[PDB]
From a paper:
The enzyme is derived from an earlier subtilisin variant called peptiligase by several rounds of protein engineering aimed at increasing synthetic yields and substrate range. Mutation A225N in the S1′ pocket and F189W of the S2′ pocket increased the synthesis to hydrolysis (S/H) ratio and overall coupling efficiency, whereas the I107V mutation was added to S4 pocket to increase the reaction rate. The final omniligase variants appeared to have a very broad substrate range, coupling more than 250 peptides in a 400-member library of acyl acceptors, as indicated by a high-throughput FRET assay.
A Trp instead of a Phe at position 189 would be too close to this Asn (2.0 Å W189-CD1 to ND1 or OD1 of N109) which cannot adopt a different conformation because of steric hindrance. Thus, Oml-1 and other omniligase variants containing mutation F189W, which is crucial for the broad substrate scope, cannot be crystallized in crystal form A or B.
Residue numbers in the entry: 1 to 75, 85 to 278
Write the structure that this text describes.
């Protein structure tokens, strides 16, 4: 919205905006550090905190959840955001809190979950939660991780590494993989994640880099697609994103390539 970012153009979201599609009547759970609901550039429809030391989901003492929220709305200006707080101010949280946030999102009929987070190990309970959300029809998106490379090893974080999740890596403004962007066969798509200007807490704006902003673009893209195709299943939304991506190089580094929401939203299955 108020801070200009190249990322919205890069994924061809303006083509949907010109068609009149802005993610109307789509519920997106921002599973992160909260959202500063006081920010003039944001609107928050609901939410919940599972961080025992940080009980307000509508404040953000980390900044990432608020930044992610702004990127989702830059891509899908009409999306309904829900602040699902599972990370503290230091950007860490327990998997049980994260799972409680996913469970809340399922119970409250979210259309899209964005998880701008991950750890190097997952759990069976974490996999069961994302698999259940996907079985329930939710589009589940996660940041692939900022762990760079490890030779031929996967560095994709959990829960992005699980097959049911859309694992999002980060490119720069010229579609080059960002040096921090995690890699491996579990990587699904890329999106803009270098120096992305978005909302920060306390009526502020600023650039951040990471797979966190990249995931936000794909969560916004899912909302644009559902506004044009509200009947599409999560299966069909996911297919539309992966099958119409712009190929960028070896799938170990780039997955299917850069999301193209214009192409995805006119995909014929």
């Amino acid at each position: 919205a108020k801070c200009v970012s190249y990322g919205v153009s890069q994924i061809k979201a303006p083509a949907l905006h010109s068609q009149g599609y802005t993610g109307s009547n789509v519920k997106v759970a921002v599973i992160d550090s909260g959202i500063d609901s006081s920010h003039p550039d944001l609107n928050v429809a609901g939410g919940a905190s599972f961080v025992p030391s940080e009980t307000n989901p509508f404040q953000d003492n980390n900044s990432h959840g608020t930044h992610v929220a702004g990127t989702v709305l830059a891509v899908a200006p009409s999306a309904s955001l829900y602040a699902v707080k599972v990370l503290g101010a230091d950007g860490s949280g327990q998997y049980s809190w994260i799972i409680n946030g996913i469970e809340w999102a399922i119970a409250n009929n979210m259309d899209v979950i964005n998880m701008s987070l991950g750890g190097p190990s997952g759990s069976a309970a974490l996999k069961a939660a994302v698999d259940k959300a996907v079985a329930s029809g939710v589009v589940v998106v996660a940041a692939a991780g900022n762990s760079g490379t490890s030779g031929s090893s996967s560095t994709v974080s959990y829960p992005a590494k699980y097959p049911s999740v859309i694992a999002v890596g980060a490119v720069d403004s010229s579609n080059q993989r960002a040096p921090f962007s995690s890699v491996g066969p579990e990587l699904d798509v890329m999106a803009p994640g270098v120096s992305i200007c978005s909302t920060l807490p306390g009526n502020k704006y600023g650039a951040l880099s990471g797979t966190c902003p990249a995931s936000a673009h794909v969560a916004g893209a899912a909302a644009l697609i559902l506004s044009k195709h509200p009947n599409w299943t999560n299966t069909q939304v996911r297919s539309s994103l992966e099958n119409t991506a712009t190929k960028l190089g070896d799938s170990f580094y780039y997955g299917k390539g850069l999301i193209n929401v214009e192409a995805a939203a006119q995909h014929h299955h």
